[PDB]
Design goal:
The chain has 162 residues and is mainly beta. 6% of the residues lie in helices and 53% in strands. It contains 1 helix and 14 strands. Bound molecules: a molecule of 4 linked components (BGC-GAL-NAG-GAL). It is found in: Virion.
Amino acid sequence: ALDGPYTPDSSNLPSNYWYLINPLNDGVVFSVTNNSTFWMFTYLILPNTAQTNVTVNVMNETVNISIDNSGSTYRFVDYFKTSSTQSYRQRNYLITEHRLQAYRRDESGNISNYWGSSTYGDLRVGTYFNPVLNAVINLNADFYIIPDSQQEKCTEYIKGGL
Ligand SMILES: CC(=O)N[C@H]1[C@H](O[C@H]2[C@@H](O)[C@@H](CO)O[C@@H](O[C@H]3[C@H](O)[C@@H](O)[C@H](O)O[C@@H]3CO)[C@@H]2O)O[C@H](CO)[C@@H](O)[C@@H]1O[C@@H]1O[C@H](CO)[C@H](O)[C@H](O)[C@H]1O
């Protein structure tokens, strides 16, 4: 149906596709930096994860972050900073039954992904207005590719699983 799966890869990805990651493992599943004003990664957290300080190696830095997930399903949590020496801070999250999240970089270089919760009723695509034109995107997960004209198909997978 879908093009894929492909093994984990880093590349300066094009803008006319959604990248549907299907991470086998928790932890860092996605990252991108422009090396100057924006660093972003997504951490997949298991259900019933009490608040924990964890050390992670991401985009060539060893950093410490807080993670938590008191829910009964998976939680993909976005972390960002806007300068080299800042600490990472949490942004949006996706609550989901499935090991699936999806990313797209728009033509202005902004990262979009899925936020919210299908079960709660506020699942949405949200865009972080922090351009990273030509930045290498690290997909730390097996993934599939979906043409940008087919966002509804991507949403279907995010909601329902593969
Ligand atoms: C107020 C509300 O709707 N709370 C929801 C909660 O919704 C948040 C999530 O969608 C997260 C995902 O990242 O985004 C939050 O909105 C962000 C927005 O995306 C940012 O751009 C903006 O800068 O900040 C806002 C605020 O941080 C949403 O607010 O999602 C949870 C989990 O599904 C819901 O349970 C929660 O609903 C509330 O649940 C409460 C008890 O658990 C109460 O029932 C309350 O009445 C519900 O509204």
